Symmetry: D2
Subunit: 262 residues, 4 copies
């Protein structure tokens, strides 16, 4: 099967990558970083995010696998010491496929609209400057949000920025996105919902400028200053990320291991 390996680029990750390629050489099992069927990431959570975004135009043809050199593997299954076992398992085709939901972000201007795919989240802040937007859900005006910004998370994204903002952790079998507030202003004149909101597939959340059409918009690691924005639109993507697995490693066990104990 066609595969490639991305490395964090430090000595540790590079050498692990070379050894895996050498091991894959004894199998069938072609290195191809143009049209891989398997993408292996070796590094931190950032390395995995880079791997995902490198191949976001062929997500339907790829199964992702992570080895984490950091603490701390939300998209890793594997430790550096387990690399030889993974080589043998991958070569044998000894795996099942699991899929997580993704978030579509559309930015409209005074055209051409830009579309982004997020594995963790997309956030919006001001470029300045007071942040004020109208929040429109399925064409109904829901609230005028004033504060620091807003975060829209995928289910797998809920353990990250979403969690820090008081959002719920959601099992990735649920096809949803979650909107959290950053430092909302609430007084007798200005009001927000002041709770995270969880949206199903096909629900559309639109942010519309009130002032003030410049925004700092993030998509996972990427952060861009967008000018002359008319709308930011959030919806669950029709696209999914696929993982190759190998052994049972339940989401809630992954949550336990990351936040409670070892």
């Amino acid at each position: 099967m066609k595969y490639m390996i991305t490395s964090k680029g430090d000595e540790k990750s590079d050498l692990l990558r070379l050894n895996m390629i050498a091991g894959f050489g004894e199998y069938d099992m072609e290195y191809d970083d143009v049209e891989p069927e398997i993408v292996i990431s070796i590094g931190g959570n950032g390395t995995f995010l880079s791997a995902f975004h490198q191949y976001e135009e062929r997500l339907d043809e790829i199964a992702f696998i992570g080895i984490h050199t950091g603490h701390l593997g939300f998209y890793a299954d594997w430790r550096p010491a387990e690399a030889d076992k993974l080589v043998k398992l991958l070569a044998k085709g000894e795996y099942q496929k699991v899929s997580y939901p993704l978030l579509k972000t559309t930015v409209k201007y005074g055209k051409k609209e830009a579309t982004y795919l997020a594995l963790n989240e997309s956030t919006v802040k001001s470029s300045g400057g007071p942040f004020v937007v109208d929040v429109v859900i399925n064409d109904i005006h829901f609230e005028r949000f004033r504060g620091d910004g807003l975060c829209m998370s995928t289910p797998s994204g809920t353990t990250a920025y979403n969690k820090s903002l008081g959002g719920a952790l959601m099992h990735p079998s649920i096809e949803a996105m979650q909107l959290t507030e950053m430092a909302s202003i609430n007084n007798r004149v200005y009001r927000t919902i002041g709770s995270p909101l969880v949206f199903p597939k096909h629900h559309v959340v639109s942010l519309q400028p009130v002032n003030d059409k410049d925004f700092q918009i993030s998509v996972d690691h990427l952060s861009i200053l967008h000018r002359d924005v008319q709308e930011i639109r959030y919806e669950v993507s029709a696209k999914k990320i696929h993982f190759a697995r190998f052994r049972s490693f339940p989401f809630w066990r992954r949550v336990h291991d990351s936040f409670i104990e070892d």
Copy 2:
């Protein structure tokens, strides 16, 4: 069609009930509180909850309709002044059916297990006394929770007790339950997740006593002191509540009307 009406029991609600029965008399359209196909509640949110629990053994045969005399209609669609329009619409069969998910609670003892159905939530607190339970998700030990208690909410329940505890609001098309913490203790020795958790259908959350087997368990309005508890088990019910509707009144508009403005 067979129907019944429950009233809050004050003069206002009783008279509205009598007038609706009188209006239903001009149609076809039989009063039957043993085997109703339509259950009409006139009162507050508590009146509606009582109506639901009065008929929880025939939820598959009933479509519920609420008129709210209070502020404040999370399960009401209707205002007292709209009662005549509702009579005509109901009599004509001019409605579509919408379903919300429900929460199953199982309490096991040193037998016979007790099972409860919740429309809003089920909560657990101590009878004393320090509250400490082991939280087990699909047979994996997730955390030892210390604090005031725990709340498990349906999607429609998320606007209630769940919201007050920092939980997310979830659209009821999502078949899920949400676990929130009450006053969790977190220090260098005791740790909880400290975020709400959202579980899909078929996931099972089990609370197991550590000490200390007596618990105050609530199911919607009902609150009971349970003794000699071995397990409390939470899962999304196979059963759903059905509503008769009539006109579009989106969940998010209902949320806006209840928390933001009019």
Copy 3:
């Protein structure tokens, strides 16, 4: 100097107590549990709280010292292994005195008022039953609180129940009390401040029943069902607790050690 020792009552604490008495026998240094100048607590945080409340009528004549057998010493300075060093230091008079603020609670009825002193906090919940009170600060109606209850904390109490409810941690040199909410209900009709409130000395916070005059009131470990309540009044006490110290052990280092690392 006159002293006494309280023990948690397990074998470990009892034996440590006997050894300290034996060591104090070689000094001057009289055991007196009626009029002690020094009160030594050996046990958990609960043991220390019991020691404080045993002697709350002579707080001006006593300096408290704690040895913690638990994790986990918010009022302990000392570990069991350090007991011999403490014996020698105490006998020598080798200490400075530090004072923390306390909370006065007054419960008024349809007389005789009951007054309580808290080292950590006093809380109020319903006996049932919906909890609703009017919050009156220096005779001005501030809010109608609906929810689970309210917690009023001393500065040293802020690391306990207060912390779990989202309250700030306050240095005990600040003569204040802090009011936190438990599960406040906020919607378009019912509103609370939804933030902790910090009150200086001489400010008086009065809770007045709306319904519904029965309340479960806690003062540190003590929890009592109070009937026919007309008012609950909170204010910073004129009384303080005094500690004997011995070496510098800053409050913020104590916070670090308890919540961050070792």
Copy 4:
């Protein structure tokens, strides 16, 4: 007495200013914006903040008075319609003076240190980029903070940015500053206190760079990108702001009026 008036600069505020000057003309009562004893602000909360910072080098010689054209007067006492009554009261010397605490911020570089005074708060965020600082309190390493940033508030500042970040509201008679977290990262490897912290006078909170010495630092409305930072130091200022008052208008009533009702 020497006075000046600042205006928001819209037609409404400008005309109110002209009328007050005309009214002050009938008294004694000299317009002097170099060395005023009374500074009158007409506009929003931003106008008042500008007035404060215009005269922060002569805070000991000035008593401030606000008229709010906005909603919404945390530093206003007065409404536009009350301007004539204020003219007469001011001219008569019919007032008492009230003082609130202020926050000193020191930014040290690889010299010359910059010092700022805040009436509401000072915040710190990254210029990029991951925000990571070591939090040092009175020379003791307290935590390594990872997240979006940190906010240090005065007592009067607690109703603003502090409130949005979950901070306590503190009565301004308390000489303190309060540190709140913005989106702190907490997992099994990274830990923060996860509660607001309230510091008395003379306590010093130092933020020290870990990476990564560029920071976006705000002081009230002012926001500056600081490069090559070695330390950010927070402490309660020896300086206070003085207000002229006129009638009793308690802080807690001001809080009620701003967040609860009218």
